[PDB]
Paper text:
Recently yeast genetics and biochemical studies indicated that the post-translational insertion of the TA proteins into ER membrane requires the co-operation of the Golgi ER trafficking (GET) complex which contains Get1, Get2 and [name].
The crystal structure of [name] full-length [name] was determined to 2.3 Å resolution. The two [name] monomers are associated together primarily through a novel inter-molecular Zinc-finger motif, which was not previously revealed by [name] sequence. In the [name] [name], the two [name] monomers are swung away from each other.
Author numbering:
A (entry chain B): 5 to 92, 117 to 351
B (entry chain A): 5 to 190, 211 to 350
């Protein structure tokens, strides 16, 4: 199992790529980098990179204004970006009943949010986009955004418990508690149907994968291990971890600084834990750069190391020149 | 609210001080430093620093061999350390309780935790009732302390609990509530009642903000911030007083050095960001900001020099040379 994302970058079967990682972990740089690498490597296919971050992280990363309308990133004719706010008559009753459910039932809020992002995609495609071959999902930093994948099971198990209890005695008691009951069954069952359809593609490892992003630090390893467990319970394919902010301190010409040297001793300790824990994962080890990486130019030079492993002995020049 | 633990260090009211923080966050160094500061500021009192870490963190921190029997740290007149393993001690006591149940087995019964473990019944309920494992484990530590307080004037005035690196140690504080419900349903119930009453007695002191407090330990990074928020919320749910956060491993990079190593400068920039977040989120807390030292900080000498910055705020302009001295 190669310490790179080369097989993903050149894959012609994947249409849905999720990228995620909590805690200032280089996630958005990684999303941008994966999108660039795939677009450069497959110039015949059209790629979309989409974010739901209210901070407009893609606009910040590329240095240009992105929005709800898909726009090509300047310098590419192959990659487009979107930034959408997914948070943004009987329908008022239908919505109010459904709003009450988002707070108490896990997966409903996430389903409605993701259904909205999918609506934005197909709208951009029909209105001369014209069709994206693969979508890179830059996942939100907060929340468990793929939780909707457990919803079809959650709410069918709830319907059976509903079916067991209601059939006790009635219809005296049934009509009393069900008085003024807004049905919302048709709106709920179509949501279940929409998820089950999405699940068919998202649980297919040839069509969909999740790339985890982390740093070589105790709490980030902890967060990564739980992220992977969450994704396994969704039956979502995960075999890629990007480890960012690595110092490779023993290498740099202009050595010294013990603070940095001690920090890399600790990073190396958790790297050995990652190597041992994730033996059959693509664990791609990415160098720290001075500042954050912004602009198409710096993003492509840095992104290359997702495809062919960074070698601190030879590639140091490239990094200390992005700086 | 001052960015130090001065009022805690000089408090003649506190009996139980908990120190905790997960992630390699300087927790052991903070426990030791709190213990040293209190013992130096209150020479007329006797202090116990106790650890429950099987890796023997206090022995490694002081460069002395500590254990089950309380020992004064060399160079100190009024600070002693203990290192025990309550889970391993409970497993041993429980195995014997089960062995006495299977055979025709009597008990000494003259109190207290030994009576709770009868038949091993309470121990195999630890999987269905949260807080039991933690209650019995903490009963083990209280037992060891009371035994160590011999008979004579060898009773400690204040105990500093260096909390274990793993688990939710103080979860037992929720027990009296979860057991009052459970038993509202509902020999075994007799043991549940003895346990509930035991924890309620602890609560009288552990929920008294004058007697008991918890010091959180973190680092200035996103995940450590949210882990600390999580810890704080946990302690609030226990009615544990918590109004102190120690932030370790701070570079203060713009000072001391100058402009050398931009990687440290970049790191310090990120630290300032979350330091600002912490300052605002926890405005009523003592937020104590502690410098990074190149290396460990081990031994009484280095630990007492470092620990002074818990009492009086580290000033990067003034105190940089002290960190170089270590
Ligand atoms: Cl997204
Ligand atoms: Cl997720
Ligand atoms: Mg990020
Ligand atoms: Mg530690
Ligand atoms: Na006996
Ligand atoms: Na302890
Ligand atoms: Na706890
Ligand atoms: Zn440095």
């Amino acid at each position: 199992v190669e310490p790179n994302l080369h097989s993903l970058i050149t894959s012609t079967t994947h249409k849905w790529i999720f990228v995620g990682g909590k805690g200032g972990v280089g996630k958005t740089t990684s999303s941008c980098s994966i999108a660039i690498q795939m677009a450069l490597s497959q110039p015949n296919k059209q790629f979309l990179l989409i974010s739901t971050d209210p901070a407009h992280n893609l606009s910040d990363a590329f240095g240009e204004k992105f929005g709800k309308d898909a726009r090509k990133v300047t310098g590419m004719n192959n990659l487009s970006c979107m930034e959408i706010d997914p948070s943004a008559l009987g329908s008022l009753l239908q919505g109010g009943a459904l709003a009450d459910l988002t707070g108490s039932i896990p997966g409903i809020d996430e389903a409605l949010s993701f259904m909205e992002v999918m609506k934005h995609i197909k709208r951009q495609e029909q209105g001369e986009g014209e069709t994206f071959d693969t979508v890179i999902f830059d996942t939100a930093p907060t929340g468990h955004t793929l939780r909707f994948l457990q919803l079809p099971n959650t709410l069918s198990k709830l319907l059976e418990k509903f079916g067991e209890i209601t059939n006790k005695l009635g219809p005296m008691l049934n009509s009393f508690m069900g008085a003024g009951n807004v049905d919302i069954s048709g709106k709920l069952n179509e949501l279940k149907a929409n998820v089950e359809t999405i699940r068919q593609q998202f649980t297919d490892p040839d069509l969909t994968t999740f790339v985890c992003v982390c740093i070589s630090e105790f709490l980030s390893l902890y967060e990564t291990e739980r992220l992977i467990q969450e994704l396994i319970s969704y039956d979502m394919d995960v075999n890629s971890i990007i480890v960012n902010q690595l110092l490779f301190a023993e290498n740099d010409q202009e050595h010294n600084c013990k603070r940095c040297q001690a920090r890399w001793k600790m990073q190396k300790k958790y790297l050995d834990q990652i190597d041992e824990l994730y033996e059959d994962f693509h664990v791609v080890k990415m160098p720290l750069c001075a500042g954050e990486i912004r602009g198409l130019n710096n993003l492509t030079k840095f992104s290359q190391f997702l495809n062919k492993e960074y070698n601190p002995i030879t590639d140091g020049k490239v990094i200390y020149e992005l700086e």
